[PDB]
Amino acid sequence: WLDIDSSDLKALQVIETELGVNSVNPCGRRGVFCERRHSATTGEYVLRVTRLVYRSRSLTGTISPVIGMLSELKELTLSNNQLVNAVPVDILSCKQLEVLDLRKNRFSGQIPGNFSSLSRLRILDLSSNKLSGNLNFLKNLRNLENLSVANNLFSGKIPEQIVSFHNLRFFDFSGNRYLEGPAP
Ligand SMILES: *[C@@H]1O[C@H](CO)[C@@H](O[C@@H]2O[C@H](CO)[C@@H](O)[C@H](O)[C@H]2NC(C)=O)[C@H](O)[C@H]1NC(C)=O
Ligand SMILES: [Cl-]
DSSP states (O other): OOOOHHHHHHHHHHHHHHTTTTOOOOOTTTTEEEEEEESHHHOOEEEEEEEEEESSSOOOOOOOOOGOOOOTTEEEEEOOOOOOEEOOGGGGTTTTOOOOEEOOOOEEEOGGGGGGGGGTTTEOOOOOSEEEEEOGGGOOOOSSSEEOOOEEEEEOOGGGGGGGOOOOOOOEEOOTTTTOOOOO
């Protein structure tokens, strides 16, 4: 029996509180998934938080900047809540992120261009929010398999690079009135 990493545990508390997830080793239950890893110190095996999955829980909070302290995070799934305000730039510290699913919330603001640094992203579902600005951050997300930005306020055009993505099997940017497709 392993224990959860002390730092991940402390970060999880603040993240859940700010999301609105209401009430020691939370791994493997209630939306928290962990994986066995070598600890920074010691080298002994410890559990790290790798997935936060909180669909359909009537959450009304926000994504705390402390999300960036979960260095091993692979999945943040927050679909079908009432979460508000901006996607924090601190999520760029989650370099291993593969799944970012924020569909059907009320997230607002813009996505900064350096979101393209999340090179491992495979599933990016921002659909049905109130996000705005351009989609230049998609330029270098070459591993995307599932991409939806539908039903937002995005404008400009899809980056031409999307034409070269080889794994893209689901793509939706409908419901963005001032948004045009990728064109040369
Ligand atoms: C990614 O780019 C964004 C936008 O330029 C950066 O956001 C700024 O972050 C600093 C803290 O590092 C804040 O004080 C600023 O207010 C933010 N600006 C905006 C417009 O939100 C972000 O820091 C960049 N991150 C990385 C890793 O490059
Ligand atoms: Cl879920």
